[PDB]
Paper text:
Curli fibers are a major component of the extracellular matrix of Gram-negative bacteria and are expressed under biofilm forming conditions where they fulfill a scaffolding and cementing role in the extracellular milieu to reinforce the bacterial community. Here we combine extensive AlphaFold2 modelling and cryo-electron transmission microscopy to propose an atomic model of curli protofibrils, and their higher modes of organization. All models share a similar β-solenoid architecture, wherein curlin repeats fold into strand-β-arc-strand motifs that stack vertically to produce an in-register double, parallel β-sheet structure with a single strand stagger (i.e., 2.4 Å) between both sheets. Our results show that the curli protofibril consists of a highly regular supermolecular β-solenoid with an absent or negligible helical twist.
As a representative structure of CS-class [name] monomers we discuss the AF2 model of A0A0E3UX01 (pLDDT=93.68), which has 15 curlin repeats and an additional half repeat at the C-terminus (hereafter referred to as R15.5). AF2 predicts a highly regular (the average main chain RMSD between consecutive repeats is 0.18 ± 0.02 Å), left-handed β-solenoid with a negligible twist (average main chain RMSD of top 5 AF2 models: 0.48 ± 0.38 Å). A transversal, on-axis view provides further insight into the structural nature of the steric zipper, which comprises a central hydrophobic core composed of the Ψ1 and Ψ2 residues in motif a and b, flanked on either side by a glutamine (Gln), followed by an asparagine (Asn), forming the pseudo centrosymmetric core predicted based on motif a and b sequence features. However, R15.5 has an uneven number of strands (i.e., 31), resulting in a motif a overhang both at N and C-termini. Rather, a proper match of two motif a overhangs across a dimer interface would require a fiber consisting of consecutive head-head—tail–tail interactions, or head-to-tail interactions with a twofold screw, i.e., 180° rotation of consecutive subunits along the fiber long axis. Disulfide formation of Cys residues introduced across the R15.5 interface occurred in accordance with a 21 screw axis, and also de novo prediction by AF2 showed a head-to-tail 21 screw in the subunit-subunit interface. For this we selected R15.5 due to its high Asp and Glu content (20%; pI = 2.98) leading us to hypothesize that R15.5 protofibrils would be less prone to tangle up because of repulsive electrostatics. The R15.5 side-view is nearly identical to the side-view of E. coli curli, suggesting that ex vivo curli and in vitro R15.5 fibrils are structurally equivalent at the fold level and essentially in agreement with AF2 predictions. The docking of an R15.5 AF2 model shows good agreement between the experimental cryoEM volume and the predicted β-solenoidal architecture. The reported Refine3D volume therefore represents a map that is longitudinally averaged over the curlin repeats.
Numbering used by the authors:
A (entry chain B), B (entry chain A), C (entry chain C): 1 to 355
Write the structure that this text describes.
Amino acid sequence: QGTTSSATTSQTGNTNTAVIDQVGGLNNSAEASQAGDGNVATVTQAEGMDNAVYIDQVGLTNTATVLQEGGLDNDADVDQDGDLNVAYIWQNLGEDNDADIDQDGTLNDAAIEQDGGEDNDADIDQDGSENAAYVGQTGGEDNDADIDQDGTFNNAYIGQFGGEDNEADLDQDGDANYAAILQDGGEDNDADIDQDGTNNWAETNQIQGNDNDVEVDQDGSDNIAEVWQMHGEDNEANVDQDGDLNNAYILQEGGMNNLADVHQNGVSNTAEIYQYGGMDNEAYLIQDGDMHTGVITQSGDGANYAELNQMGLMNTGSITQDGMGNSAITSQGGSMNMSTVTQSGTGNISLVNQH
Amino acid sequence: QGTTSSATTSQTGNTNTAVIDQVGGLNNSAEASQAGDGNVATVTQAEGMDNAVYIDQVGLTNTATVLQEGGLDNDADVDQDGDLNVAYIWQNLGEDNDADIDQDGTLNDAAIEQDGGEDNDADIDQDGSENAAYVGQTGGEDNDADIDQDGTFNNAYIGQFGGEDNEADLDQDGDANYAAILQDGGEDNDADIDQDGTNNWAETNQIQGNDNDVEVDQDGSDNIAEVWQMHGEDNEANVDQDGDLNNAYILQEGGMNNLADVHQNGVSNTAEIYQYGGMDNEAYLIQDGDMHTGVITQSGDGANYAELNQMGLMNTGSITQDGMGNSAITSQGGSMNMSTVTQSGTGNISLVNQH
Amino acid sequence: QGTTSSATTSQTGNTNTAVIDQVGGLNNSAEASQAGDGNVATVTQAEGMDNAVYIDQVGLTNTATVLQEGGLDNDADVDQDGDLNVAYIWQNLGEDNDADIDQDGTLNDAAIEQDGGEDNDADIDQDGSENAAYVGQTGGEDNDADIDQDGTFNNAYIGQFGGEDNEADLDQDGDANYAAILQDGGEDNDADIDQDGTNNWAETNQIQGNDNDVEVDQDGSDNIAEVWQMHGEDNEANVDQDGDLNNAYILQEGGMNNLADVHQNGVSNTAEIYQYGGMDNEAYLIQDGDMHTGVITQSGDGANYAELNQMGLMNTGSITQDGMGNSAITSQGGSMNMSTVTQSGTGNISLVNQH
């Protein structure tokens, strides 16, 4: 009942399975090429017009499934080179959506889901063994998601529910690294996660924010980073962890032009930053050494500046600012230093040095 | 110089001519009976023993010629009822050869030639106007040729050059139908052509094949069917065309138990099947609609299955299989669908659905 | 490089400035609390162990500076309530030194300096406007200095250079009163100054004396009292002035158990007492009236008794005693009486009555 549909299957090898089901639609194109043994390719295009699906499998027992239900000019591309790679692509009711999966290696699992939307771009590139990647885009226009995993046992999750021009970039290199990016609504949100090493945990969330920027960089082992930005405009969060067992938490609820920066070098350092609204609030938490604990809390409108630097072992620091223009700088050197700063009002200046 | 020859002439009517010339031979029998006006009968038996010739003409200006040169127990029978019918029988150096011509109507031309061989049976039955039939048997034992034409301007050709137990059956009903059967060598080859309608062209060729079966069935106008089977054992070819301007071509070169099936309903449908060797290769090409183009090619040893179904207008399909056990099923529905499937190797499974 | 230092800043209001600098040291504690507008707090702890600094400012533009360089268990406390109050505390190389400043009012200036020593206690309490107080303690053990000023333009100075268990007490109530206490060496020296009124001048000096007691009490306007005790043990000086323009001078150079008493009531009375060594020398100078002039001089070992009483206007009296056990009693009544007594030797008894 559909006019001008095109389907091509090319199989070289032993026990290769290719299934193409084009039910309805005008000028749908499906191509499945399998070189090797035991490769499985499934393509299902339903009610879509000018939809393009391309699957290219090389190796042993590679599995690829593409399901495009409706939509105009949807493009899906799967390229598997290796053994036991699993790829899944779903595109429902989207216009001009582009999905790309490129897996090289063994036992790689990649999934891309695009439910509606226009001009949504999803790209997954996995190299190595047993890497798991998921990209989900529900609604929205011009949303870009990119995942790049190299190594073993790496878990990557990217979710974009609504919004225009939201960009998510995930890069993992190493073993057993977990990275998660969530963007629920908002325009021009940029999230970037970069993990190098073993067993690193990174999570970023941007809810209903415009022009929010989150950057997480982890190098080493067992580093945990969590970033939340809710209902804020032009908020910037930066996390940099080098070493082992470092824990960083950043929360920015509302506000415009709020900047949070966490820098940790060493083992078992804990940093927490909380910003509740306000304009031009700046928080810096630097911990060089082992077993550092730092807490920064800001609530107020206008140019609140907090800096907490801890060098050495087991230094404890707490800074709380409430009001306008409060400036607090705490620098701890040595072992077992404890600092507590509480500022309320306008124009408070506090300098704490604990050598 | 020959002992016990018998010749009988019985003519009733005006200007009937009967000539019997028995030169040499023992116990040759010739009988010519002509009832009507202007009938011409010629019998010439030379050097044959126990040869029997019978001519029976009824009507106006019927012409019959029988020439038996040598041979043992050769039997020729001509029965013409009508006007201007022409019958020719030639039997050279054959033993126990039986030739039968039965023409009823006007301007019918029938020719039977048997050069050598033992127990060869040729039968021509024409009813109608201006039908042309030719049967030729050169050598071979127990070869059976049968032609049955009813209607106007029908052309039938049957040729059997060598081989044992080869059976050719030709049936034409209608106007201006052309049918040709050729069997060059081989044992137990069966060819059957059945044409109903106007201006149908059918040609079947079996060269040096054993137990080959060809069946062609055409109903309608301007249908063209061509079947070639060369050097194959137990190969089966089936062509079924219903409608107008349908073109079917089947080629089977070598192989054992290869099956080709073409089914066309409609106007201007084109189907081509090529099988090059192999065992248990199966090809099915079904075209329901108008202006369909289908091509199936199989090369490989073992259970290659190809199915190409096209429903509607101007659907184009190509299936190519090389190797062992390849299975391809393509189903096109709608208008202007294009499908291309290429399989190489062992165990390839391809399913193409273009609705 | 220092372990376990603690610093706390709490600012409520507008344009408050708090600076805490802890360079080196073990377990140093600094706290700065500022409620109000424009308050300035500076704390600097260097190389000290277990040093405690507390600053509490309430009001407008209060200034407090504390500098503790080294020492063990040094405690500094500043409490300002009001506007434009200035407080300065310096503690250098002292152990267990306690400094307390409490200013309530406007434009009060208080300074405490403790250079070395163990268990030195300094306390300043100012209530009012533009009062200036200074306490200095250089060396010594268990030295106690207390200043209490109430009113306007009051100047208080306390100095203790060396010595053990030296006690200085200064009390001023009124306007433009100047009081000075100096203790250079000696053990168990007690100095007490009490001024009530306007423009009163009091100065007490104790140099290298043990168990010396000085008491000055001034009530009224423009009263001048000067007391000097040098190199004496158990010497007692008492000055009591009531009225206007009264001048009292007491000098005690050496000696044991020497007693000097000056009592003046009225306007423009002049009293001078000189004691040069000796044991149990007693001098009494009483002037009730206006424009009295009295001079008492004692030089000798043992129970020298001098009494000069002047009642009325412009009475002039001079008593000179040289030797042992001289007793002189002069009583002047009336106007313009002149008395001159000179005793030399042992056991001289003089009685002068000028009615």
